[PDB]
Structure formats: C-alpha cells, structure tokens
Amino acid sequence: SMTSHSWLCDGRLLCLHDPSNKNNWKIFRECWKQGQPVLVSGVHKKLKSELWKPEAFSQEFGDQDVDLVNCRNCAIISDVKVRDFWDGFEIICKRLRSEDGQPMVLKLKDWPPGEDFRDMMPTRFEDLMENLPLPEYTKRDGRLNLASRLPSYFVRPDLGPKMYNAYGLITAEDRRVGTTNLHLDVSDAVNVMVYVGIPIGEGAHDEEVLKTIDEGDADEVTKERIHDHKEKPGALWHIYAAKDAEKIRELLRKVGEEQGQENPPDHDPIHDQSWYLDQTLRKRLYEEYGVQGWAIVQFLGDAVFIPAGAPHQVHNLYSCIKVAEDFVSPEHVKHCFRLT
Template identity: 80%
Template structure:
C-alpha cells in the first residue's frame, strides 16, 4: 500500500498477498519509480502485456524453422539430460507444437527437448537482427534493462571489471507431456551472476493424438493459457 501511495501514476496490482508487484502497462514512463522500491528489497517484479507489443510472427516456431531449419544444433533430453547431437534445428521446431513430429526415444516415446545454446554464444544480435530490435524496442523498464539504460550499472562498469554478458539469450524448450515429467524440469536450479529480465515471447499448446494422461495435461495447459490471457500476464 505504501508503494502505491508513492507512485499513483502507474497501472499496477499486487499478487501473492501483496508480495509481488505486477506492472500492467509496460510503456508507462513512471514504472521505474515504483520498480526501484521493490528492487531495493530484492523482490521480483512481474510486467504484463509485453506480448501484445511484440511482433508475434517473428517468434512463432514455424518462423524459426523456415529461417534457420538447416542449422546444426545439439538438443538436450530433459528427462535424462542426455545430449542429442548432429540434428537440424527444424527437428526441434517442427515438433514444438506437433507431438507426432517430435524425436522419439528408444522406446518410441516423444522426448521432452530443449535447444542447447542456440543461438550460440553472443550471436543473437548478428543472427537475428530483426528479433533483436523487436525485443530491445519492447523491453519493460528500459532505464534498467536496455544495454544503454541510464540506470543499467552493468553497462557502465570500468574496463578493468569483468563485465557480465548482457545478452540477450534465448531459452527454447518443450512443455512437459506426462505427470511423470513434473518430477523434472527443463533447466537446472542455478544462480545468475547478475539481475535479469525474462520475457516470455511465445507459449504453444502441442497438438497430436496423445493418450488420456497427456490429454489431461494439455487441457491443463489450455486452462493456464486462459488464465494468462485473462490476467494479462503474457
């Protein structure tokens, strides 16, 4: 309540019994004022509505498959962390929303996969300039999150410091298929060396001919998507 009094000119709400600030207008120039009060306390902040500002056609699986499908990549089987080498990136993207097109394990079951380091290293800007510009143009809280943001201290570290990688990095993974998959995740628990802004640019609902267990999970995903849409948390 105190923060709302400090900055009444932002469209925001409080989630999780007042512990999570949700900024509802990513273009509001006053967002940084209320954000900094939460940031001082080490609290996360959720910004909704960014997906409505992005060029959605750029971030669809079929767009990545069409433009970059012939690139060689490594995949990770999220169920056992095994590396799958010597595959084309279209092998991942074509199965993103179509379960029958997914690579299968030795038992003939579709795997839960993620792309390993793609685009590699610091190649995002060079390999995907249009997507880079679309993302940079629509980052929330640009004072903090843009490379040249006036409050982005990482961009102003002296040269004798080892500067953190300011990204952006892409994270691409399938959703979990069965109830057994809930015991695993698509990334390991880790600690980043700097603060980060994470933007969910696309969420897909896989189609196919799943068994009853998979169908229940997919129906649950649809409910989540409806909740995200209604809450403007995309």
C-alpha cells in the same frame, strides 16, 4: 478498469500492467531494492507477432547444426538440424522418439550460439530491445544499467539477448523434472515469454497442467488467471531471495549425502545446476530451514525480473520461446564484485 498494477504471491510479488508506462520506475524501485522479483504483463501486445513463430524459425534457420537435451534424463542429442527441433514444437507426431518409442521432451541448447543473436536476427533484436519494460534498467545504454560502466573488479554480463526454447513437460513423472535446474546469476535479468505453443495429437493434456500449478504452490489469484482461461500459461518458476542461497546449499548437501552422492563438505550444489526442487524438497526447505520462495506462472507476454544472486528454477507447462537480457542495476551491483 485498467489499473497501473496488482499483487500476486499474497502481496509479496508486484505485477505491473502497462509495459511502456513512463511512471513504472516509481512502484518498481521500492520492491527491487528489497531483493524481490517483479512481473510485468502485456509485452506480447508491443511485439510483431509474426517474428516470434516456431514455423518462421524453422523456415529461416532450419539447416543450422545444433545439440539438444532430453529434459527427462539429461542425455545430449549431438549434431542434428535445428528444423528437427522446431518441426516437433507443437505437433507431437513429428518429435524425435526415445528407445521406449515415446516422443521426447527436448530443450534446444545454446541457440543462437554465444553472443550471436544480434548478427543472426537483427529484426528480432530491434523488436525486443525497443519494447523491454523498465528501459533505464534493461537497455544496453540505460542510465541505471552499470554493465558498460564498470571496471574489471566486476564480472560483466555477455552481450545479449539469449533465447531459451524447449518443449512442455507432459506426464505425472515429468512434474519432478526441470526445464532449467536450480542456479543463480551474478547479474540481474529480464526474461520475456514471446510465444507459447499448446499442442494437438496428444491435445487434451491440460488436465495434468492444473495439478502442476496447484502442487507448485501457486497463489489463489494466479489460479484465477489459470482457471479464467483468456491467457496462455508458459512456465512455472520458483525464485528464492539471494540472502537464502547458503541455506539452500545446506539442504542440497544433506540430500546429496542421503542419496549416497560422495561430495566434499564445501562443494556448491547451486553452481553445479544439477538439482530441481520438487514438491517434497520445497516443503523440506520451508519446514527444516525456514525458507519461503516465490512460485510464479509466466504467461504469454509476461516479463520476469530476476534479482542478481537469487537462486531460481524453470518448469515448462507448454512449449515456450523465452528471450532474456542481462543488466547490472545499482541496487544489486555487490553481487558481481570480485573482492571480499
């Protein structure tokens, strides 16, 4: 039976089922006020699927110059064509190779660049913005988005949305690497999975994906969503409450010192965006500091709501196209105030 919602993370994560239900706000606002993330499924069914394919991006924009990142070692690949990224998105035999002769796991950096999504892709912009869930919070002019309404005493978000494009991590060694390292944002955000690419060539690689979700601490109901098939898994997230950010900084200063980094006692390891919390570090955070997070698998068409101030990291299971919009809810406006 169709239902309004369900729970993941053993009751700690709200999952809304109908992205355009006019009564979603009544269930959402209780969880949101408590500083929790929220998941909304089904957004892909609202979108024009032909606008979100890797082959269309390559055909329309392939001659633009861009930089890539090697996710395994953080090396920058400078001033290449955007088709060099898109043509290897699902076909492994077409990827740029490292010195060892392996195909690289790449992230497309800052594309479209800065605030240029709307000018570059006006049809994509309309398709996304008209289909975002919780539209009183998430639209540029929504009644519960204070972004356009605040004076300079508040850090205001850039004009969005922003696109996040990267290959899937593949090997047992790759399990300890992030697509996006641990960081926080002073605005709220909604992140939508608009396409998941499952390759062919080294097709048959779903085996190491199961071990990553399991070791990632995914709850038993998320494992039913994985093991049932039916839906394509994109990325594994770990999100932490804003109230636990300083305890995470204390752990990462202790570990930086143990690993012989030489850092002033005050430096900010979350702002540096240099760490990925692997299974060893997540267990140490729980046991030594008393901090629990939320382990979230974002499937095709899932919208993740990330509260302002909440530290979070992303690990792509397969090749992903994500689109995110920042907003300023009244519940979390304290996180962007410039005094006290």
